[PDB]
Each structure stands twice: as structure tokens, then as C-alpha cells.
């Protein structure tokens, strides 16, 4: 849990990447909070080929799946944290919803497969990093 496994790729929040992720690095983007590493096993997930703006994600802090409506991906100014300085984060989709420390990594899904992964939140919002344009994963 906390990652998307598609083909021979593992997709994780960049800020949560492991040593083994970096050893097997395929691609990373700080402005998206995304990192993709190589795997030895084939993954089970599918990347949604769609423009759905409703779906379900897993919330780690509640151990529950929740339905969610979220904005189209956008450039969003995200305030400083112990993970990044204040910056523009692109590809970020916002929903009203619960979040707490440790929720980053929860996978957002629709009928077409994986849509994104929890990256940010606060002030009553949850921000998901969209992955649907990374067509090279699938």
C-alpha cells in the first residue's frame, strides 16, 4: 500500500520514496510530488484512461475508502513544509475531505482504474496528484 504498481513500475509520492526507489529510479518530478521506480514483478494496477472527476480513495488515517469529487488538475501554490519549500505544484486535483498526517499515498480510483494519489491537504481539502497523463506507465 501507498504505491501504484503498473507493469514493471512502482509510483509513489516523491517525498515518501525509499532508498530502493532511488536505486531503481525511472523518473521523478518534484513539481508533481511524484517518483517512479523499476520493479522486478508485474503490477496489478491500471492507469485510468479518462477525465473522471469523481472516484473513491483510501484514507490511511481512517482505514476507510471514501467517495470523492475533485477538481480538474491545476497549478496550485502549496505552502512550505518539511518536505518542500513554498512552490507551485502542478497536476493537483482538490476535493473537500478529511486528511491527517500519513494520508499521503492513498490511491484514488474510478471505474477506469487508478486516477491519482494523495499528495497534499489542509484547510478541509485533500489534494491528489493526477497520474492519468503518464501513458508510458501502462
Amino acid at each position: 500500500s501507498g504505491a501504484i504498481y503498473v507493469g514493471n513500475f512502482r509510483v509513489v509520492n516523491r517525498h515518501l520514496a525509499t532508498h530502493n526507489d532511488w536505486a531503481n529510479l525511472v523518473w521523478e518530478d518534484s513539481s508533481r510530488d511524484l517518483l517512479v521506480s523499476s520493479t522486478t514483478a508485474q503490477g496489478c494496477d491500471t492507469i485510468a484512461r479518462c477525465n473522471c472527476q469523481t472516484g473513491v480513495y483510501y484514507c490511511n488515517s481512517r482505514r476507510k475508502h471514501y467517495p470523492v469529487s475533485f477538481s480538474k488538475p491545476s497549478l496550485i501554490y502549496v505552502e512550505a513544509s518539511e518536505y518542500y519549500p513554498a512552490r507551485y505544484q502542478s497536476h493537483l486535483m482538490l476535493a473537500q475531505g478529511h486528511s491527517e498526517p500519513g494520508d499521503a499515498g492513498g490511491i484514488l480510483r474510478c471505474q477506469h482504474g487508478v486516477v491519482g494519489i494523495v499528495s497534499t491537504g489542509g484547510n478541509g481539502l485533500v489534494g491528489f496528484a493526477d497520474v492519468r497523463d503518464l501513458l508510458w506507465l501502462d
Binding site: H15, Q89, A104
Partner: peptide, 4 residues
């Protein structure tokens, strides 16, 4: 960006 989260990861707490």
C-alpha cells in the same frame, strides 16, 4: 505536500 503531506507525508506526515
Amino acid at each position: 505536500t503531506l507525508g506526515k
